[PDB]
Amino acid sequence: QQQQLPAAMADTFLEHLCLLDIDSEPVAARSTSIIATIGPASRSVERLKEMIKAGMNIARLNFSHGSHEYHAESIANVREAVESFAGSPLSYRPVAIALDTKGPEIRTGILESEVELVKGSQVLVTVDPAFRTRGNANTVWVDYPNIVRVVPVGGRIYIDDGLISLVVQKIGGLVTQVENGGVLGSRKGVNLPGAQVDLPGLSEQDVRDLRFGVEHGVDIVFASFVRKASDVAAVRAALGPEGHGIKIISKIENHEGVKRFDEILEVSDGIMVARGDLGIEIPAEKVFLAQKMMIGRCNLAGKPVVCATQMLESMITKPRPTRAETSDVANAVLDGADCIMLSGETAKGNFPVEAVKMQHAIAREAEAAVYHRQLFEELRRAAPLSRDPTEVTAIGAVEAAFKCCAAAIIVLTTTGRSAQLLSRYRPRAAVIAVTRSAQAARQVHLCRGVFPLLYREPPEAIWADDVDRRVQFGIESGKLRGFLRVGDLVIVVTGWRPGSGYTNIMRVLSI
Amino acid sequence: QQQQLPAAMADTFLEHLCLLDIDSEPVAARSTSIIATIGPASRSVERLKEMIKAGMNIARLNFSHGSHEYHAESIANVREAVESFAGSPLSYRPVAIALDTKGPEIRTGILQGGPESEVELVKGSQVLVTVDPAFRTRGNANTVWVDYPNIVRVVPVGGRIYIDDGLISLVVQKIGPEGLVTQVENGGVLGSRKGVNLPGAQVDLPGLSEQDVRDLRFGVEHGVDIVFASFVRKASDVAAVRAALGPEGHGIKIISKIENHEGVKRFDEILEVSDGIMVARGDLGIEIPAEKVFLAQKMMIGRCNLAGKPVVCATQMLESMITKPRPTRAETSDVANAVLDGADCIMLSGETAKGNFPVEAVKMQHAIAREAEAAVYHRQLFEELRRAAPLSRDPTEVTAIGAVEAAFKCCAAAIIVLTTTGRSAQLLSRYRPRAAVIAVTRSAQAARQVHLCRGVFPLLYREPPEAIWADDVDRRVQFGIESGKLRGFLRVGDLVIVVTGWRPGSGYTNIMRVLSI
Amino acid sequence: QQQQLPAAMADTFLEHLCLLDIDSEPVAARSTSIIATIGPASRSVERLKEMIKAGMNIARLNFSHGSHEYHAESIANVREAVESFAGSPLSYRPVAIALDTKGPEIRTGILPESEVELVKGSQVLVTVDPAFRTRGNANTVWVDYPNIVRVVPVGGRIYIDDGLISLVVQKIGPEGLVTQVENGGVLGSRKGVNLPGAQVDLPGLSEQDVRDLRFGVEHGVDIVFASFVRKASDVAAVRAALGPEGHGIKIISKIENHEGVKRFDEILEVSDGIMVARGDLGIEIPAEKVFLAQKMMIGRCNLAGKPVVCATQMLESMITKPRPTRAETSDVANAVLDGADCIMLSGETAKGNFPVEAVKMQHAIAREAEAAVYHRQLFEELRRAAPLSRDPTEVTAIGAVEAAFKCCAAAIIVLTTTGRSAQLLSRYRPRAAVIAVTRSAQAARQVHLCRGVFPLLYREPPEAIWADDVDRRVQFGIESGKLRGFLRVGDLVIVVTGWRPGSGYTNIMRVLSI
Numbered sequence A: 001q002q003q004q005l006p007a008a009m010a011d012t013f014l015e016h017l018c019l020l021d022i023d024s025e026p027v028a029a030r031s032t033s034i035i036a037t038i039g040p041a042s043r044s045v046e047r048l049k050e051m052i053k054a055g056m057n058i059a060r061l062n063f064s065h066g067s068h069e070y071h072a073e074s075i076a077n078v079r080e081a082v083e084s085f086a087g088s089p090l091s092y093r094p095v096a097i098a099l100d101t102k103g104p105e106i107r108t109g110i111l112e113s114e115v116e117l118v119k120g121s122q123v124l125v126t127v128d129p130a131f132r133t134r135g136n137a138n139t140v141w142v143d144y145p146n147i148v149r150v151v152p153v154g155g156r157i158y159i160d161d162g163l164i165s166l167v168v169q170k171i172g173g174l175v176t177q178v179e180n181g182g183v184l185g186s187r188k189g190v191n192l193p194g195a196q197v198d199l200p201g202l203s204e205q206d207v208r209d210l211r212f213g214v215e216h217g218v219d220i221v222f223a224s225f226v227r228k229a230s231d232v233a234a235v236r237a238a239l240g241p242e243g244h245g246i247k248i249i250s251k252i253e254n255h256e257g258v259k260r261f262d263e264i265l266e267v268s269d270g271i272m273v274a275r276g277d278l279g280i281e282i283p284a285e286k287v288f289l290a291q292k293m294m295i296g297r298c299n300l301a302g303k304p305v306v307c308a309t310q311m312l313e314s315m316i317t318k319p320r321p322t323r324a325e326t327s328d329v330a331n332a333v334l335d336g337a338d339c340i341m342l343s344g345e346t347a348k349g350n351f352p353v354e355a356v357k358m359q360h361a362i363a364r365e366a367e368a369a370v371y372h373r374q375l376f377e378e379l380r381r382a383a384p385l386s387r388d389p390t391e392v393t394a395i396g397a398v399e400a401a402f403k404c405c406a407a408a409i410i411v412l413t414t415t416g417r418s419a420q421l422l423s424r425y426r427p428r429a430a431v432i433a434v435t436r437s438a439q440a441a442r443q444v445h446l447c448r449g450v451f452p453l454l455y456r457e458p459p460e461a462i463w464a465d466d467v468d469r470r471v472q473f474g475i476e477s478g479k480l481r482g483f484l485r486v487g488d489l490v491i492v493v494t495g496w497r498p499g500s501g502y503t504n505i506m507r508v509l510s511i
Numbered sequence B: 001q002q003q004q005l006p007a008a009m010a011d012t013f014l015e016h017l018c019l020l021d022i023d024s025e026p027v028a029a030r031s032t033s034i035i036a037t038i039g040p041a042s043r044s045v046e047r048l049k050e051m052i053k054a055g056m057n058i059a060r061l062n063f064s065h066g067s068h069e070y071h072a073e074s075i076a077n078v079r080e081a082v083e084s085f086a087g088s089p090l091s092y093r094p095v096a097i098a099l100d101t102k103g104p105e106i107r108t109g110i111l112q113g114g115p116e117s118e119v120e121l122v123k124g125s126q127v128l129v130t131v132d133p134a135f136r137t138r139g140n141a142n143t144v145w146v147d148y149p150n151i152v153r154v155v156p157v158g159g160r161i162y163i164d165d166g167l168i169s170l171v172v173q174k175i176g177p178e179g180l181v182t183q184v185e186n187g188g189v190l191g192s193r194k195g196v197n198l199p200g201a202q203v204d205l206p207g208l209s210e211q212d213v214r215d216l217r218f219g220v221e222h223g224v225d226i227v228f229a230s231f232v233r234k235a236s237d238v239a240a241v242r243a244a245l246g247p248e249g250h251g252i253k254i255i256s257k258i259e260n261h262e263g264v265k266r267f268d269e270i271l272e273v274s275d276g277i278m279v280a281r282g283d284l285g286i287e288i289p290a291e292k293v294f295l296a297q298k299m300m301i302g303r304c305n306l307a308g309k310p311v312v313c314a315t316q317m318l319e320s321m322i323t324k325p326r327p328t329r330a331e332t333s334d335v336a337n338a339v340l341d342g343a344d345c346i347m348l349s350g351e352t353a354k355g356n357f358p359v360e361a362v363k364m365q366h367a368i369a370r371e372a373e374a375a376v377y378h379r380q381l382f383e384e385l386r387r388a389a390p391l392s393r394d395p396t397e398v399t400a401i402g403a404v405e406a407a408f409k410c411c412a413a414a415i416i417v418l419t420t421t422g423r424s425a426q427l428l429s430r431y432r433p434r435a436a437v438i439a440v441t442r443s444a445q446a447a448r449q450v451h452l453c454r455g456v457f458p459l460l461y462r463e464p465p466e467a468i469w470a471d472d473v474d475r476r477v478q479f480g481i482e483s484g485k486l487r488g489f490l491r492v493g494d495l496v497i498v499v500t501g502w503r504p505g506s507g508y509t510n511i512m513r514v515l516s517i
Numbered sequence C: 001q002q003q004q005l006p007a008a009m010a011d012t013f014l015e016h017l018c019l020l021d022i023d024s025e026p027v028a029a030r031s032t033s034i035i036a037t038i039g040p041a042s043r044s045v046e047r048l049k050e051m052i053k054a055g056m057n058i059a060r061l062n063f064s065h066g067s068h069e070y071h072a073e074s075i076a077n078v079r080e081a082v083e084s085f086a087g088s089p090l091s092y093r094p095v096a097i098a099l100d101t102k103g104p105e106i107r108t109g110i111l112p113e114s115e116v117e118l119v120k121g122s123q124v125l126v127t128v129d130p131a132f133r134t135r136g137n138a139n140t141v142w143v144d145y146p147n148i149v150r151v152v153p154v155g156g157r158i159y160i161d162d163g164l165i166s167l168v169v170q171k172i173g174p175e176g177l178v179t180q181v182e183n184g185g186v187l188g189s190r191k192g193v194n195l196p197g198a199q200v201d202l203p204g205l206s207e208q209d210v211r212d213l214r215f216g217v218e219h220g221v222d223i224v225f226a227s228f229v230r231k232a233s234d235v236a237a238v239r240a241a242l243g244p245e246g247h248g249i250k251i252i253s254k255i256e257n258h259e260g261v262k263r264f265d266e267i268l269e270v271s272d273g274i275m276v277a278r279g280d281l282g283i284e285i286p287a288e289k290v291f292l293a294q295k296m297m298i299g300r301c302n303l304a305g306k307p308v309v310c311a312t313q314m315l316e317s318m319i320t321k322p323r324p325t326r327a328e329t330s331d332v333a334n335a336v337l338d339g340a341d342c343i344m345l346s347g348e349t350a351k352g353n354f355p356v357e358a359v360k361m362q363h364a365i366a367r368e369a370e371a372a373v374y375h376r377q378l379f380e381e382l383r384r385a386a387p388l389s390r391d392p393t394e395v396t397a398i399g400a401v402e403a404a405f406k407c408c409a410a411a412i413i414v415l416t417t418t419g420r421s422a423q424l425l426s427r428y429r430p431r432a433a434v435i436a437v438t439r440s441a442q443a444a445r446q447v448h449l450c451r452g453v454f455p456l457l458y459r460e461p462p463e464a465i466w467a468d469d470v471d472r473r474v475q476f477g478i479e480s481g482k483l484r485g486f487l488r489v490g491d492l493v494i495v496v497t498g499w500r501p502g503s504g505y506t507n508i509m510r511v512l513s514i
């Protein structure tokens, strides 16, 4: 038997693990979405076509660098590559565009010149506007005046990707001692571990970039350095009434964010575990604790969570990943991540397509290895009772799919919500979501197991005929894509009237 | 909060028990069907109307006694009482009729003194069990004749022989050509033609008696809904019952009564070929040690729960109420624990057939069952039935498990299902939803027969089909809604799950819908 | 094959039930203690010897009726029967004596054995006029509780004589409550009255109760079943009446009415244990609800690690018949499965025609039911519900129960002075018998309240070296278990002892082969 089915009906998690079989081949479609970061290695139209075919679902624009015109041509190239497949609607794969904000930052001043900060020496952190350019071996200027007031005596300041460490010995600027020394250049990043950083939820650059995103029709914003619900409120307000339909994924990057996670998740559409900056702000050996916690809570809430950063790092230069990297991707999927991410592996590396292919393969294997027995039971016990017919129908459809080992659940959705409520219970069966909304077809990639199909045909005269035509579009797209076959059982989820919010019908159909 | 919902949301079985509340009042309709035995105390049309109103769901005809004409008048009176309520279709309660077979028997002989004569079997004395036809009418204090010759090859030295409902006990001292020389372990007064039980013995009786063949044909001829097959030891016994019912009685449900050691040990084989099971604790407690009966009961109900087939707990549940208006604490406990064990139906025998408080007995079983149904620990029960039920490609069963899951998700007041044969309602009942399973059907026999499944409330729809089939489906769903509203089980604002099919005819159930009332 | 072990290794409760086997024979000794009510049918020394051999562990004296001299005679006869077996120390069975208090009551008036019939469907006047005190008849009942006329509305029910007679109030007036007989019957003089759903205010201890508790202390009873406990103050009154000399007496609070059920937690907190007194309870609350109350209280008692008693009408038909009904066997078995530490017989042993047979039947059923316990889920839930502890006795106890489960130990042998180490073992419900060796005669009797504790009274003076005396007591437990059939050569046993003499220092678990 395939799909790790021999291990699926185990009575314990230990027995489940013991029964996993490297000869049990994955048969279902890949459910964990792949976010690929755009850069020189992944900007050309032909390369992006290759990456779409490889399995890329979300194109990420890192607004930490690059002009507005650079990102506009990035969007143009991505959209050209995506729409080259629009001529075959039954095979067209929607691809989302995500804007990753530069975010609030603390930077040192200008001293290609560099100076050495020696361990055991005294170094003054100053915010005097006069020191913008006068950096020294014992003097560091920062563009964050209120730094003087948020890092106590005994507090630490991290400079240049955590390579340099300073400990405040005396306050009043902040007189520090070099704990970990090194060579410092100009305008390097500063992190304040354990501190309440008092920067606004959005920088001015962030405001301009978000207006750019709205004007260019991006689907998702990965909001950097989110520490509280008010940061998400600021992002949402800057997006304005024009960007209300855009999904906001809050990036948790520092201690405050992790500790205030509940209030952040409550006001966000989803979460990104930004392990890079997190491993600068908190001890590296603790990052996994953060990851599994956040993923766990996101799974409970039914909201997407993205595991990010250095998943396949070695593939920046070599054609095959390390054993730790394959393990990390598989374990992110097993933790419960809806999406996995590649950064330098696709933006600048020498094997972007190969890295996408690797994440696809690992994710498929790991999704097949999920212990649906206990996972479903715990999601059932923790999700609160609900009188909303969409959620009632969703849990009934997932239960039915598990009962008959359905090849898929085909759901009609306008906004994506019905597919997301199906996915929150983590069915083994693919959730094929037929929609006329192009933006929803792109945004549902954030939810594990949702396979978007964009319907283009004009509405039929009789709504019931239109519903059935969309259902058959789901069937024929699944058949052509090889995931659906004659004789299979499927679960079909629809609603009793037109418009979003009225899903209330579950059907069992044979092909 | 009501319906024992605080105990329903418990994380462990112990906490569930700790959270039960005598002030939490039950809200769902009573789901465990009540079988009442018809007799002198419960034969008049008016009495039967009272018993229907009190909650009787199945009228049981005990063919151990009574002529064909007696049982025909019993059937006519039950049907008159049932149909007196037909004038209000939204409140009409179907009532099933079950034929309980006499079954194969072993009987003693007629005593020498004559029909109205008695002889004393003295504890500690020698008694010859003989099958010589010359002693047929030669019964005395030291010799008992039986109409079952092979007794001499099924009771070895050390075996027990029970006479008159277990009142007399014998242990075989030696075996020989004259018969079994035994000594009286339990003595007593013996009459003529008394019943014999052979505990632990492999009995060779046919599985269906000749009078049984005839009585089953009376059943088919009078349209009985269910047969309680007595003394089933074999798949072959129930197969013989099935053959005797013939092609004309193919729609009649066969409930096999397990009454001795063989049946309990052979249980799976009987269950495989039967529509359901009766735990016949009366004869069982003579055939096996009384202190073991509960084991058999919990085993059998369990397996029936596993198989999705009805199981009936039977006999002496409210025994003291044959003479008293209130039951003993053990009796109420027994009814409640029969519900908790997982029984679909409970039974009354002497309590309704001959007792002085038949209607009150029905009312007490109703009250207790309602409390106990509220006390079910649905979390673990549903999870275990899910884990034990095999995967299925039958759309009716897939729809059933999805509908029950949904009903649990929204605390649905009911699951409304359209069914022709009852099968869709039974597949819902097998997963034991807290929500009532309201089954709308045009089949009067199916409306009667679905009472065997816990939680199925049958409604007989009578209006001819609408011109458009979908309009007819919607009209039957609305009929279910209005019946539930009038009967107090549904109110405005409730959620219900609606289970339908994609085309007319039995076997095409595949649709579940979430609707607000 | 046996002790229902095939069902013991089940993965679900449903599968556990499916795996039960009537051919799987119980092998362990009977762990649920049996309380027998003493009466005319069970007062002679010879009869009591029969009942001890049948399995009686606790003798209950019902002080609702009978003089002090009568109960003294009961005590003397029970003790004579018990000590007649002391000549074989390896087989001697301790037996506890429990005093069941009369409790506060509401009673009808005096009509000696004159009787009147209250006919169903007739009119009956319930009066509290002191002029009608002695004028009871077929249409008039006087009651010694004046406020009855103010707490029973129209439609309210009044039960008379252990619930045998039922009246429903039709009209209320200055003369009293005009009622209709709902359930009729024969009424004697001064019969008990119950007011279901009424808020009745009665003293927590009567004067007769104080004297009866003094009698109990003076005669060395081990347990008091305190009747009609509704709040912690009632058990405090019982404890105070027992006085400084009766500090060692165990208080089992009888829950018999609505208030007791609602205030259960506070009562259990101050009590040694609980009796689900289903007789009065089933009159005080609706009959169809008693099982809820029962399963709740037993559950909480199991949660608390305190003994709980299931009582009344368990084998009622055996008052007149030599065999019980199927419901009665079911009731005993399900009381054991619910988690009761003790089961009880009342009229079945006090006045019925088959007292020894009732004891034997409860013994057989209890053995069968104990084998059918689903220890996997039961142990896991008790472990997760029991608090973490730094007390070495409780730590050792849970370790020893885990060990016994791991090797299917035939017994856990424990040395105990007060019974506490045995009780902490019992709280985790081992399949293995907890064999408790003690020098305390009173503790040997009292530990019968704890399921699975088999008390052995050690009589030999201490050995010179304390470790030798410990080893000798352990070997005494072993040899008693061998002679009584609970232990065989090749069995494994868990042995629980302490590092120094005196109660409270249990801290050692050892694995031994027989």
Ligand SMILES: O=C(c1ccc(NS(=O)(=O)c2cccc3cccnc23)cc1)N1CCN(CC2CC2)CC1
Residues within 6 Å of the ligand: B302, B305, B339, B340, B341, B342, B375, B376, B377, B378, B380, B381, B384, C013, C014, C017, C295, C337, C338, C339, C372, C373, C374, C375, C378
């Ligand atoms: O009180 C009960 C009891 C009995 C039946 C009952 N029924 S139930 O519907 O709630 C139910 C739930 C969980 C699994 C089940 C499996 C098959 C049937 N019914 C089940 C719920 C509770 N006990 C069962 C036997 N113990 C004994 C053993 C643990 C020590 C405890 C008592």
Ligand SMILES: O=P(O)(O)OC[C@H]1O[C@](O)(COP(=O)(O)O)[C@@H](O)[C@@H]1O
Residues within 6 Å of the ligand: A390, A412, A413, A414, A415, A416, A417, A418, A419, A493, A494, A495, A496, A497, A498, A499, A500, A501, A502, A503
């Ligand atoms: O998941 P959403 O956004 O609530 O969309 C579900 C909706 O889709 C439908 O199935 C189809 O609606 P449309 O015809 O408007 O596309 C509705 O019946 C249902 O309410």
Ligand SMILES: O=P(O)(O)OC[C@H]1O[C@](O)(COP(=O)(O)O)[C@@H](O)[C@@H]1O
Residues within 6 Å of the ligand: B396, B418, B419, B420, B421, B422, B423, B424, B425, B499, B500, B501, B502, B503, B504, B505, B506, B507, B508, B509
């Ligand atoms: O429970 P059963 O006997 O399979 O009946 C279920 C059937 O009832 C229906 O809902 C109604 O069918 P009818 O119109 O033929 O009565 C069918 O769609 C479905 O197949």
Ligand SMILES: O=P(O)(O)OC[C@H]1O[C@](O)(COP(=O)(O)O)[C@@H](O)[C@@H]1O
Residues within 6 Å of the ligand: C415, C416, C417, C418, C419, C420, C421, C422, C496, C497, C498, C499, C500, C501, C502, C503, C504, C505, C506
């Ligand atoms: O259960 P209890 O009352 O604490 O008794 C346990 C005690 O029994 C013993 O095993 C034996 O003590 P003694 O020698 O004083 O009887 C002690 O080591 C232990 O503290």
Ligand SMILES: [Mg+2]
Residues within 6 Å of the ligand: A103, A224, A225, A253, A277
């Ligand atoms: Mg950052």
Ligand SMILES: [Mg+2]
Residues within 6 Å of the ligand: B103, B230, B231, B259, B283
């Ligand atoms: Mg029979």
Ligand SMILES: [Mg+2]
Residues within 6 Å of the ligand: C227, C228, C256, C277, C279, C280
């Ligand atoms: Mg009492």
